[PDB]
Amino acid sequence: SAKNNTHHFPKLLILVGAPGSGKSTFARYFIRTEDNWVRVNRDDFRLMQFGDSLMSPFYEERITKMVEASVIALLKNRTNVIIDATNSSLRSLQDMVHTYTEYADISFKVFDLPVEELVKRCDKRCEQTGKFIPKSAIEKHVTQLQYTKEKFDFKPIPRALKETSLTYADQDTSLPKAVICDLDGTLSLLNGRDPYNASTADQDLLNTPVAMVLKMAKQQGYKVILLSGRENAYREPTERFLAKYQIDYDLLLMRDTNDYRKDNIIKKELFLEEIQGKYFVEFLLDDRNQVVDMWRRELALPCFQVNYGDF
Template identity: 30%
Template sequence: MPTLHITRGFPAAGKTTWAEAFCAETGAVNINRDDIRRTLRIGQHGTQRQEDAVTSVQSALFAAAVDNRSDIVLSDMNLRPKRLRPFLTGADRAGYTVEFHDFRAELDELLRRNAARDVERQVPESLIRDLWSRFPQNRWPSAERIIATVRAMTDGTFSPVDNPRDLPHCVLVDIDGTLAHHNDLRSPYDWARVSQDTVDESVRDTVQDIHAAGVRLVIMSGRDEVCRPETTEWLARHGIPWDELHMRPTGDQRSDWMVKDALVRAHIQGRFHIRYCLDDRQQVVDHYRAIGLKVFQVQPGDF
């Protein structure tokens, strides 16, 4: 049975070195977006049209390798599980096994290795630091969880939310990236410092108007429940009204969209009619829409 190998890791973590050696030894096909960019003479980050072209080539190479029943290596960072969905789905349908290969390294080591690279292969130090902050290694979901999630999405396990209009109306509002911004003053997962966040005045004004009109405000947050006291204090300090606050259960490391799906079904469905949702994160926006909810995306949030 052929195998799909998926690497995970930051720039300079050793993914390419391993993939090239592994493919030379086994004959597996290595598919890498940076290689495609170099072939197309695109820089490290092209325009949206160029990146779409890279994705098209990547998908075509994957389909050809699957048709040949070749072992495949996807040797990119692969830190955003949703971007793996078409490949995991294709591999599942074609009878492939899937193996994840994690390449972990401390920040100082990544920066040292990056500086030692050939100039054309170096990435900005700021990019490595940003990725390190946004994707903490201790929060990477397990391979089993990613595969199970993709299968659930493909199989339609996540059915539309029952949302009858004759129930009391509410609006679902996100916090991080919607009501609040950490502005790189803290890690997105540094729950002890959420009180330092700045408020988004436009979104605050909007939710104040919603609440004044008699519509219930339900805050749905991917924050860990451990920072509920700091979060409620922050909301009060910034004059943000709310009727209910639902948060990620302590220690739950599922993706935001999965957490919010579970919160909606456990606490909202059957009690309220959801008029719409305010959120920024693309994975949540996409999922809300997939289960039949109206969403206003307050800013880009593809992370």
Template identity: 30%
Template sequence: MLIVMRGLPGSGKSTWAADRVADDPRATAVVSRDHYRMMLHATSSPVDGIMEDEITELEADAVVRLLARGHTVIVDDTNLPHRRVREWLGLAEGCGVAWRVEDLTDVPLETCLERNRHRDRQVPEDLIHDWHARYIADGRARPKVWEPIPGGFIAAEVGAPYTPVPGTPAAVLVDIDGTVADRFSADGAELRGPYDWSRVSLDRPRAAIVDHVRMAAEHMKVIFLSGRPETCRADTLAWLDEHVGVPIEGLYMRPAERPQDRDSVVKLALFDEHIRTRYTVHSVLDDRAHVVAMWRRLGLTVLQVAPGRF
């Protein structure tokens, strides 16, 4: 089961969650954005957008894995926007487990403020007032019925666990930008903008990764998956031929109908369409953290070639 806590800081969410864990510590787990912030950044306060996205991925990944192991999982966050609750509920349904919302938004604002004043790590009071005004005041706190968003907020990034089809050829999946290709020179000068697809031929090959791909090509198929648009296919193929120089089993790129989708969403769709039932995937070379997390949720072995927090 997934239990989604909801309420202001000081409403009693963490106390409620701790009591449930005490009742059955072997079968109950708590995940919290604050825990991840403390582990990663030594603060319980929100950090910048990129880091918050990374925390979202880590938290969701932990929930999926714990649910798969049969735990009751409590999400101990404020979860004040209705959409965030609905996304968690959709994730639960996508994992095939029951859910419920433990809503503490009826705890009076003054009670929350008073409790907050006695906490070791206080939340700024103006922030609590702001959240109350935006999400709770004037009867906006609870919908009559919680309607899950199918699949949840990582719906398009949570595919079915990968099981190779016996007898299919072995393959390595390789990302391009930031993996085999670098848009910066060896001394750090920018060779092209991140979305300047007309100049991908200027990219610098990353020698160590190219060597790895060449060694892999001696034993298995090499398939390139890229978030680049199809408009630069010809230049990309020419660059791979010149700088990597291995037989290419396939080059699958961002479809025109997915211009704004995250790379993880695009690559999962490409994987399901072209690779899942046709190859035995040995490993994946990629750099972006959210894409790496998606591959690992499938059960694939990933060699992350750079921090990739973007």
């Protein structure tokens, strides 16, 4: 059956409330009495920067990348995260559920306190530490909730994996069939060579399996197009390597000498000036994360990743 193979996922609890509504105070008792739980808190990331409250748009943007990097690292580890909501304003509150919903059964606890018991512990708090929240900034927050409280139910929303259905770009199938292959790290294992100093590339090693894909694809209508981010300066240690392994190919495209831009955007530029409209790409074989992301995400082509990128 399928009804009975069911899987379970980490919980994310989002604490929705005005400053003073006892968000913290709950988490303090929660992560001590419940069991697999870590708290993430934005203010504390501020303290790391030695700022007490609300800082530069610079710091603040970065802190977010930290918060999200943290909540997810924890969530991936099958650890529950409790975090304060960023605001009460529906769309940042939505932004949160987008960010984290691939990863966890989300739940919410609202701290809906009346406006003047919120000041009467904001002005008993703001005697405690240095911080302060006026009777302005509290109320943009209290009523802000009462409105977004009204047009959204703080219902549990179980883990959503949305499978962006793999949809490729629409190609003119009358064009000739072809496969496109990267060099550095894909068909050519550079093997301790300088990534950027490709002057000695005629003594690289052959990624045998990729070669046997090109060696098989050319045993059909497929034109085998090589597209390397290596400088054209180094074109003759390169087709030295290729002939050496009888990797015959219809077209070798290379990076303009002295270009130096990120190797995705020169490949994309390379692809459109030299391949698109003139071929039918069955699939591509590349290696580097940045570049496979380009192919798949910007141009919607089939791209088979051969080994690990992330450089």
